[PDB]
Amino acid sequence: QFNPYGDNGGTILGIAGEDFAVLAGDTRNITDYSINSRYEPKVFDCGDNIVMSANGFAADGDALVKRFKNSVKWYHFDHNDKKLSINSAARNIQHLLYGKRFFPYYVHTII
Amino acid sequence: MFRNNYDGDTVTFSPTGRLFQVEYALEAIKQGSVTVGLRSNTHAVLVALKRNADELSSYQKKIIKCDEHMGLSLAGLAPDARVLSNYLRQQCNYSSLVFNRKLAVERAGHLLCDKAQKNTQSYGGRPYGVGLLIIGYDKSGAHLLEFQPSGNVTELYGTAIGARSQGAKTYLERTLDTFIKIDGNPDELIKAGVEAISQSLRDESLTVDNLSIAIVGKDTPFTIYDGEAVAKYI
Amino acid sequence: AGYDRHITIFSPEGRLYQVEYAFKATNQTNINSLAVRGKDCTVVISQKKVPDKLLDPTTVSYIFCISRTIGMVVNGPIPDARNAALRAKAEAAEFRYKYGYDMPCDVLAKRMANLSQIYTQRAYMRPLGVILTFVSVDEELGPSIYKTDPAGYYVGYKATATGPKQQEITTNLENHFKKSKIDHINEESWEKVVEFAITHMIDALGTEFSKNDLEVGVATKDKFFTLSAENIEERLVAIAEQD
Amino acid sequence: SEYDRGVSTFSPEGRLFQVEYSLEAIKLGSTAIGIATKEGVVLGVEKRATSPLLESDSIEKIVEIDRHIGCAMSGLTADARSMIEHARTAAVTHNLYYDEDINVESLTQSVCDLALRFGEGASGEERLMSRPFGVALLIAGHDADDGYQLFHAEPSGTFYRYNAKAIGSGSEGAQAELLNEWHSSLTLKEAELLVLKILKQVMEEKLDENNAQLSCITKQDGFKIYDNEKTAELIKELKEKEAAE
Amino acid sequence: GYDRALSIFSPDGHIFQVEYALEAVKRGTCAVGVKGKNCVVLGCERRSTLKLQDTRITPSKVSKIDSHVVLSFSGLNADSRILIEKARVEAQSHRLTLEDPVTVEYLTRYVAGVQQRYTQSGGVRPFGVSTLIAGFDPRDDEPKLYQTEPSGIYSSWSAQTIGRNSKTVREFLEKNYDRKEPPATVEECVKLTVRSLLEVVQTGAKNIEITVVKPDSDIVALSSEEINQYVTQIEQEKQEQ
Amino acid sequence: MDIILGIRVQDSVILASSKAVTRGISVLKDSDDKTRQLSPHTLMSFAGEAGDTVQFAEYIQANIQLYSIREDYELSPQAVSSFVRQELAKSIRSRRPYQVNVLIGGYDKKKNKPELYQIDYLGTKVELPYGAHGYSGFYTFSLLDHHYRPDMTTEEGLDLLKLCVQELEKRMPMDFKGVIVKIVDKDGIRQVDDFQAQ
Amino acid sequence: SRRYDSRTTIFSPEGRLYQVEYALESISHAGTAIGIMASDGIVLAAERKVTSTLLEQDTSTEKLYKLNDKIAVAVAGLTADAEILINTARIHAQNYLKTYNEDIPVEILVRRLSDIKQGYTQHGGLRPFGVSFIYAGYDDRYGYQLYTSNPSGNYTGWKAISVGANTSAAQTLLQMDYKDDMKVDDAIELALKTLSKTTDSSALTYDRLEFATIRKGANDGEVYQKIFKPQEIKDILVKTGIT
Amino acid sequence: TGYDLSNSVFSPDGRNFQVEYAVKAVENGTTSIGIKCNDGVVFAVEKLITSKLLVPQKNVKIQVVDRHIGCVYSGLIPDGRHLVNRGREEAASFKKLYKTPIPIPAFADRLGQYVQAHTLYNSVRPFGVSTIFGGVDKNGAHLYMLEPSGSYWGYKGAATGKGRQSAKAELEKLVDHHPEGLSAREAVKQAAKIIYLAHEDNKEKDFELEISWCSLSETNGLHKFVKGDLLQEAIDFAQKEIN
Amino acid sequence: TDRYSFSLTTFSPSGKLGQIDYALTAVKQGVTSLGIKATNGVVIATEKKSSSPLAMSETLSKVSLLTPDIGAVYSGMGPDYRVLVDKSRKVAHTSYKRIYGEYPPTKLLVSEVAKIMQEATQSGGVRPFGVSLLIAGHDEFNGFSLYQVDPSGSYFPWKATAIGKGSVAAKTFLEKRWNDELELEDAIHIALLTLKESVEGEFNGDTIELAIIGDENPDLLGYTGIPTDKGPRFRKLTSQEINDRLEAL
């Protein structure tokens, strides 16, 4: 029986300040009881002043983000390099995620 | 008497081996405004003369981005260009996500040729009525190309297309030895392009409302200068 | 005012000229071919005109090997014939696969005369301007020869001809068969039959041939082969004296 | 004489006449006028009814695309209903995906990428619909990036942005007049009497609040279509200033 | 000439094929819709010219689409039967997906939607029908009356007519129907509908069909006598002056 | 399951149908009408799976009504139930079948006779003098086998049906929250809002 | 020159559909067929057109057909176009029976068919049906019924109708003698008493006819449908006015 | 004539003019030549510099297929690239199936069969180019030249384009004074020569020469571009003899 | 010429589809062929013409077996008939034998074939078949049968008839010497004397192809053990059986 999922540990955190925001996340990456790398980032700037991190199953994470970033790219292409309002961003991420409602991305994402 | 039973469809060869419908297409590129492109060994440049309707309407742009390192200017039927420039944006994105390598300019030519291709060999349609000058900066430095609706993409050093484009091409053909060497300095490569374009004006002169410019190179991601910002060249 | 433009419209006298015109194209070939059957062999003849010091003749034939038993000769443009040669060349492969045994000459010709009929009634394409001549040594009829045309026709030939010279190569044979009162050439080996055609052709054309002006193939007890370049010179010699 | 019968046929001088005739179809519509002001944008149209038994509001020549975008069409009505429909879906969808309002020009954009779907034959993709739409659009809207904008959509597939523009049977004289009136510092009430004035002019029939419809859009209240009493007195209040000078 | 196809514009921006379809509506018999302020009344004429045929199941020109909406036409008979069917089904599908029964405009819109769909691609011919849709929306009391053309456009009217000699009947209506004050009685609203056809009927009430529709899904056809009871009362004041 | 009873008498059909609706632990309603009139003289009760139940009912109703304006004639009880069994019949062999059981009771103005058809989700149809779906039969069928007579008055039927319910209450574990009764006849459908108002 | 009759997809400047009109014109080339209503039955009478000495006609039929066990039709026009319909007309008829488990009402069946004929008039690449039909049947909704349908897709209900050749004549004569209640054996009378007058042949010979009728009563609480045999004809034919 | 409009149509003499006109467009493009040395081949094309603004060394007209096939054509340039991409798939799927890089002779049919096809349907335009290509397989080197009708053969060396005859007579020659395979190196040299001599039809339009070759000894089985030093030599080794 | 005879989809002002009649012309041209119904059999025959005696005519049938109780012949475009045949022998299994465990009656095969003949018509983009066949067979409940099928798709039943060039008169000859009684041997006779005048070539055993439907041949099966499976009624006479009946005129 082929099981398409895996957990690569990790923890991320996001606090919203009065006029700034942070998003942290350790760099360790694991598999069961072993180490895969002591430094493998899980927190990226996606452009338009938006940080994002998807934590859970390593691969679904990389996928979502890439998929999100390629999406910011086209939002500009179609609306005159207009800036992506972080709220407008979350709404968009929803559709991305719900896109796979029946073969879900095994991750907890945070922008 | 005196008909031409060989120009009804893109799918018919005249007795001499000519595709008239395609020819008429180019003719529509001649009827459009002018645009110029020229490059050195560190940058490429697009200079275009936007046109308009009333003193109330806006000037229709003709420079289009495609990636951080690529773009083009157009002449002719606006819509066709949209489709083309768009197909291009797609091709670059694929070559970016999948392989993670910036699409080389020559490749973008082949691609725009093979797509324009299909429309000269099948029944029912018509050929794209629009010419484009593409510019970019891959791993072989600067790059300039000139595509025509027949699927003929040629890589130049400079050029212009559009009504009266002639004069500007002439100019570029002389000042060549001069600009091909304008390296490290963008401000001069553009002043050159602007000179060359003026060789094609007859009605008015370029004002801040109808002038468009664009550059890309070594440490300059494809950016477009519009209106109030191109003033230092007028 | 265009009957003859469409492959589907009948003239007031049920003609369909497009199919008719198809034929004249089977002639601008300017190559003649006759095929005669032995008693356990079958041979087809055809001239090999190579009008250019540049074309390397090895790649200049009008007879291909459909299957390891059937051979074919075509009276038409190398492009069109090369097509047909392929379809049939494939019908063979598939037939075997779907039925357990090697496909007969007589059949393959019917798949084609049929194929070039549907080809022509549904109008899904223009009819190929060539004539196909199928030869082989069947295990239920040995000396077998069938020939299909563009109009989707076919039949058996005790030995036939095709080219810009139908009647000549033909009548010449009608008088030779009018005597022997039989329907086949008598001889124990191919070698000798071959000699019979070249022999009985120069007679109708009125010209000598060398090891390059002709081209022949033959069929044995299940083993179709094309006559060699140099080897064709052989029987040409042997029959240059027993006149 | 011979090259004007195929929507995919270039004339010897690189022209597509069927497309041109398409436009000539609009001139037959009644006039529509749009004037943009730093206060808001105005849209007005001549109704022109064949009979007194028609119900006026039956003729939707000005409609809402969304709370912040409205428009007036001219040309074939059936062809309009289809664009208006697409446009509305375009807006609402974008809203759904982004939780925001579609830029006026980005909407106008999608409306043109629709007309761009004419042509029958099969040279690759597929866009089912034979010929060009027979209608133009005056899209008045407003968004946080470029403020009050006014656009002109043509079946050709292109569009321009205007300060003021007129389409339909009268766009000839109307466009001239507007060329000599419009100025950046026009108030909303000022443009209303101007759109109203130019219609009366190059219109025809006695200008009553029955054969003339007037609307406008603002940041504050979005797209609103002026009711009959308002327009009615806006006409009197108008026709009056004509006495003196 | 340029009137050969639906996909070609004439130099002046027309599309004649669709226009010619309309020329057929004029061929059919006359229909006339007249609304009051508590009802709507449709009227027609019977092609009573060549009869030795049945009578029982003779078309009334007027058809019900739902319990609260009726439709009448003019033009290619056979063409009309399909629109009536298609609109009937849609009327039931609407209830299935929204509980609420259709609105008179939603129906008119759906119909004209179809009529227009048949003028899109070539290898299709526009319906040679023109129609009048009348009725009352669900739990509403404002009478409604719309008309649709072969081209695909729809419109609402206070009263309207289509078919041969519709120019005449229209003139009449125009100088009689008061926009400010519609017939306030079903009886007078009928009277007005009748007297209008009585200018193209060629005498007799044997050539006139009348159907009345009020609110609350209450519809009802008229009989031959009742109809004559008006031909009667209007043939009086006619020479009475 | 829900309660679905029905009985044909002298000149009419009577339908009983429990009123409660339950989602797991709670009872979201105790006044639900499991009925749905297909036409002036045809009535159809139902009971089955949560969603499937009324999506189907309405669908059927829509078809009948369509047919009725189109033909301007009213489809007969016999032909109506036939149509239903057809659909359900096709349903059972489809990606996902409706799990709905039904009772159809109409008045055949053509024969002037009341008729009651009982159909289960499998497409099994049968004409009966009285019927019930699910577990509902075991508690009643004997009482009706005992007292039912074809000559019965509408007035007598109700009295009978009352007994069956009283039994359903005394021995059934579920509390169905009472029933709602309805009568079909030459004059159409009406609701005995007095078996509830009692 | 230039005319608007090149296809069905085209309105003439006056909204005419010529192509359809021409099909409607193909009917006047068919054998006359009649249908007469009666207080207790319906009669179908036709007159075989085609003729020759050696033409089998005692077994097979050409103008009268059973669609339902309670519905019958008279054909007139394109032979092949007639069967295509007749068959589907039969399938539809059985689906109604299979769905409602009742027999399909006449008007419904006539309407379904007219609705198909309608459709071949509005879509490109299609040619309308060159047929006309006289439907005679009975259902519990409206007792006996007589209907007619043409290529344009319209249908109607007559009390006595004729289609085919010399319709003017046949139609006229009927319009005259038809008594509105007329019993069956008087309609079968009037059938020939009309067909006769509008023929050509030196004499009206039995082998040139086709009769069928629909009767019912208290007896068989249902309908009996009969299609006369060559015999019964040659007989009832004499009982009238033929030696 | 009405026989030169459609692409499928046969003229009364079995002539397909649309394909012929196709050729007229081919013998007008630039000039392309193909040399077959002992082991491997040599290709060369004439590139025309219209203006001074044309980055040199760029805008290549010779394409490699897989990694062992040379390929050059003349006529409609877009049609060019096209016919080759197909060849590129046709190649690839073949190696993916059999492992062994595609047989130069096999390859040709694939292309022919394809070009073949564009002469069958009237909804498409025949290929407007003549193609020359070849490479080294298991049976050494081969050199073909396909044309607008799909017709083709093997050559000792050939060429098409506006100026081809001179290229031919000065080509047949090399054959006569060398009957036994030319020379790897030497081929290149004499190649750059055969172009110049043929350019005298574009004389007033300065040009740029492009050569590629494929050889079991210099390339090592693979097809490579002749750039660098040997590229110069070959030019002068031709510029000298041009005097 | 009209402007209506070049479209299957087009009605002439009178009401005549065109392309059909010209198709029906290619038939009225083909070689003469006839069919006679007996009382205990049915005979179908058609002539043969050689392009040249260099060709083997004994490898191209003209009287074909569709079912072991039905055979058929033709007059018109050769090639059509060849495949129209194999499509008929199939639509005979897939449409009847495979649903009813038995072969089809005469009437229905002829109609299943006219069905395929119909398609060729109703539809632009294809041309109808230039052939007209006479199909003859017999089935238990219907006795023997004779039918004609034209491109128009229509089909009729005869007692005797002919189609082809020499038909006007051949169809006249038969008319004279036919009566309900002729035994099969008589028909086989009457046929030859009619296939007689209708020729300019010769009258040997090869240039004549005739077959007939009659009694069962318990020999022509290949097996024996099953009582009911008795044999095929269709018999294509051999070159010999012929010329013998030719001597006795």
mmCIF file of C-alpha atoms in Angstrom, chain C residues 107-241:
data_model
loop_
_atom_site.group_PDB
_atom_site.id
_atom_site.type_symbol
_atom_site.label_atom_id
_atom_site.label_comp_id
_atom_site.label_asym_id
_atom_site.label_seq_id
_atom_site.Cartn_x
_atom_site.Cartn_y
_atom_site.Cartn_z
ATOM 1 C CA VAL C 107 -7.062 -10.854 -49.980
ATOM 2 C CA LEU C 108 -4.634 -8.013 -49.397
ATOM 3 C CA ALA C 109 -5.707 -6.794 -52.834
ATOM 4 C CA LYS C 110 -9.355 -6.766 -51.683
ATOM 5 C CA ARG C 111 -8.522 -4.938 -48.476
ATOM 6 C CA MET C 112 -6.968 -2.343 -50.702
ATOM 7 C CA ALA C 113 -9.565 -2.243 -53.444
ATOM 8 C CA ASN C 114 -11.998 -1.857 -50.576
ATOM 9 C CA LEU C 115 -9.846 0.618 -48.667
ATOM 10 C CA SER C 116 -9.551 2.734 -51.823
ATOM 11 C CA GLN C 117 -13.321 2.584 -52.205
ATOM 12 C CA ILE C 118 -14.368 3.814 -48.752
ATOM 13 C CA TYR C 119 -11.394 6.126 -49.291
ATOM 14 C CA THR C 120 -13.450 7.317 -52.333
ATOM 15 C CA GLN C 121 -17.137 7.220 -51.278
ATOM 16 C CA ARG C 122 -16.986 9.015 -47.951
ATOM 17 C CA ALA C 123 -14.725 11.625 -49.531
ATOM 18 C CA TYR C 124 -12.310 11.686 -46.649
ATOM 19 C CA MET C 125 -9.456 12.274 -49.122
ATOM 20 C CA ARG C 126 -8.363 12.331 -52.785
ATOM 21 C CA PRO C 127 -7.864 8.924 -54.474
ATOM 22 C CA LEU C 128 -4.269 7.832 -54.940
ATOM 23 C CA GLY C 129 -3.133 8.090 -58.559
ATOM 24 C CA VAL C 130 -1.502 4.685 -58.845
ATOM 25 C CA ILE C 131 -2.066 1.070 -59.885
ATOM 26 C CA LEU C 132 -0.931 -1.697 -57.581
ATOM 27 C CA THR C 133 0.190 -5.133 -58.729
ATOM 28 C CA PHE C 134 0.315 -7.863 -56.036
ATOM 29 C CA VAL C 135 2.379 -11.008 -56.658
ATOM 30 C CA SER C 136 3.170 -14.088 -54.561
ATOM 31 C CA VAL C 137 3.158 -17.879 -54.216
ATOM 32 C CA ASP C 138 0.030 -18.714 -52.188
ATOM 33 C CA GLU C 139 -0.322 -22.084 -50.406
ATOM 34 C CA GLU C 140 -3.765 -22.518 -51.986
ATOM 35 C CA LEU C 141 -3.001 -21.196 -55.467
ATOM 36 C CA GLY C 142 0.769 -20.715 -55.799
ATOM 37 C CA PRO C 143 1.252 -18.610 -58.953
ATOM 38 C CA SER C 144 -0.993 -15.751 -57.947
ATOM 39 C CA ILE C 145 -1.327 -12.247 -59.426
ATOM 40 C CA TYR C 146 -3.882 -9.551 -58.563
ATOM 41 C CA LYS C 147 -3.997 -5.874 -59.520
ATOM 42 C CA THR C 148 -5.958 -2.989 -57.967
ATOM 43 C CA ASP C 149 -6.543 0.496 -59.338
ATOM 44 C CA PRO C 150 -7.693 3.965 -58.068
ATOM 45 C CA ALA C 151 -11.372 3.358 -58.756
ATOM 46 C CA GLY C 152 -11.286 0.502 -56.239
ATOM 47 C CA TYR C 153 -11.080 -2.357 -58.703
ATOM 48 C CA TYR C 154 -9.122 -5.591 -58.805
ATOM 49 C CA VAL C 155 -9.039 -9.080 -60.287
ATOM 50 C CA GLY C 156 -6.777 -12.015 -61.101
ATOM 51 C CA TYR C 157 -4.265 -12.005 -63.923
ATOM 52 C CA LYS C 158 -2.593 -15.038 -65.467
ATOM 53 C CA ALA C 159 0.097 -12.447 -66.215
ATOM 54 C CA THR C 160 -0.537 -8.754 -66.917
ATOM 55 C CA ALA C 161 1.041 -5.441 -67.943
ATOM 56 C CA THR C 162 0.857 -1.781 -66.924
ATOM 57 C CA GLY C 163 2.369 1.482 -68.132
ATOM 58 C CA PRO C 164 2.131 3.894 -71.115
ATOM 59 C CA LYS C 165 2.148 0.732 -73.196
ATOM 60 C CA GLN C 166 -0.793 -1.439 -72.186
ATOM 61 C CA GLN C 167 -1.800 -3.252 -75.394
ATOM 62 C CA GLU C 168 1.692 -3.850 -76.836
ATOM 63 C CA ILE C 169 3.159 -5.775 -73.916
ATOM 64 C CA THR C 170 -0.356 -7.231 -73.615
ATOM 65 C CA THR C 171 -1.339 -8.398 -77.125
ATOM 66 C CA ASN C 172 2.206 -9.666 -77.545
ATOM 67 C CA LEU C 173 1.331 -12.023 -74.704
ATOM 68 C CA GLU C 174 -2.176 -12.815 -75.981
ATOM 69 C CA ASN C 175 -0.608 -14.365 -79.095
ATOM 70 C CA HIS C 176 1.984 -16.299 -77.081
ATOM 71 C CA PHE C 177 -0.719 -17.647 -74.791
ATOM 72 C CA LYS C 178 -3.052 -18.089 -77.757
ATOM 73 C CA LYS C 179 -0.637 -20.857 -78.816
ATOM 74 C CA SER C 180 0.410 -22.709 -75.644
ATOM 75 C CA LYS C 181 -3.386 -22.894 -75.088
ATOM 76 C CA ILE C 182 -2.605 -22.945 -71.336
ATOM 77 C CA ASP C 183 -2.837 -20.227 -68.668
ATOM 78 C CA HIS C 184 0.769 -20.221 -67.436
ATOM 79 C CA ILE C 185 4.450 -20.352 -68.338
ATOM 80 C CA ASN C 186 6.057 -23.781 -68.136
ATOM 81 C CA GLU C 187 9.454 -24.144 -66.477
ATOM 82 C CA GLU C 188 11.024 -25.821 -63.440
ATOM 83 C CA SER C 189 12.920 -22.775 -62.133
ATOM 84 C CA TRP C 190 12.439 -19.005 -61.882
ATOM 85 C CA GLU C 191 15.780 -18.158 -63.460
ATOM 86 C CA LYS C 192 14.376 -19.403 -66.761
ATOM 87 C CA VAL C 193 11.001 -17.613 -66.444
ATOM 88 C CA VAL C 194 12.694 -14.284 -65.755
ATOM 89 C CA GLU C 195 14.552 -14.767 -68.992
ATOM 90 C CA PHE C 196 11.144 -15.307 -70.582
ATOM 91 C CA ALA C 197 9.774 -11.856 -69.654
ATOM 92 C CA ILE C 198 12.776 -9.657 -70.517
ATOM 93 C CA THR C 199 12.870 -11.763 -73.647
ATOM 94 C CA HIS C 200 9.157 -11.335 -74.344
ATOM 95 C CA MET C 201 9.242 -7.606 -73.593
ATOM 96 C CA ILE C 202 12.162 -6.258 -75.575
ATOM 97 C CA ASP C 203 10.068 -7.750 -78.339
ATOM 98 C CA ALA C 204 7.193 -5.338 -77.682
ATOM 99 C CA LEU C 205 9.188 -2.209 -76.822
ATOM 100 C CA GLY C 206 11.979 -2.621 -79.330
ATOM 101 C CA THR C 207 14.980 -1.919 -77.124
ATOM 102 C CA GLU C 208 17.930 -3.544 -75.417
ATOM 103 C CA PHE C 209 18.404 -3.516 -71.630
ATOM 104 C CA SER C 210 21.497 -3.735 -69.414
ATOM 105 C CA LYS C 211 22.142 -4.302 -65.715
ATOM 106 C CA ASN C 212 20.434 -1.023 -64.843
ATOM 107 C CA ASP C 213 17.719 -0.382 -67.450
ATOM 108 C CA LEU C 214 15.488 -2.995 -65.873
ATOM 109 C CA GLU C 215 14.315 -4.257 -62.515
ATOM 110 C CA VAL C 216 12.735 -7.533 -61.501
ATOM 111 C CA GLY C 217 11.532 -9.511 -58.523
ATOM 112 C CA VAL C 218 10.167 -13.021 -58.132
ATOM 113 C CA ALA C 219 8.240 -15.188 -55.671
ATOM 114 C CA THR C 220 9.189 -18.726 -54.599
ATOM 115 C CA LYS C 221 7.723 -21.275 -52.179
ATOM 116 C CA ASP C 222 7.136 -18.620 -49.546
ATOM 117 C CA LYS C 223 10.200 -16.308 -49.910
ATOM 118 C CA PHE C 224 9.844 -13.084 -51.973
ATOM 119 C CA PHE C 225 13.081 -11.524 -53.252
ATOM 120 C CA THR C 226 14.208 -8.588 -55.418
ATOM 121 C CA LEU C 227 16.630 -9.347 -58.207
ATOM 122 C CA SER C 228 20.151 -8.121 -57.523
ATOM 123 C CA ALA C 229 21.829 -5.310 -59.452
ATOM 124 C CA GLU C 230 24.642 -7.372 -60.959
ATOM 125 C CA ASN C 231 22.635 -10.602 -60.969
ATOM 126 C CA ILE C 232 20.061 -9.133 -63.357
ATOM 127 C CA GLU C 233 22.913 -8.966 -65.891
ATOM 128 C CA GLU C 234 23.209 -12.760 -65.716
ATOM 129 C CA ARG C 235 20.010 -14.125 -67.246
ATOM 130 C CA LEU C 236 20.333 -11.136 -69.583
ATOM 131 C CA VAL C 237 23.520 -12.768 -70.900
ATOM 132 C CA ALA C 238 22.266 -16.350 -70.960
ATOM 133 C CA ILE C 239 19.277 -15.296 -73.091
ATOM 134 C CA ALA C 240 21.384 -13.125 -75.417
ATOM 135 C CA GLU C 241 22.356 -16.186 -77.482
#
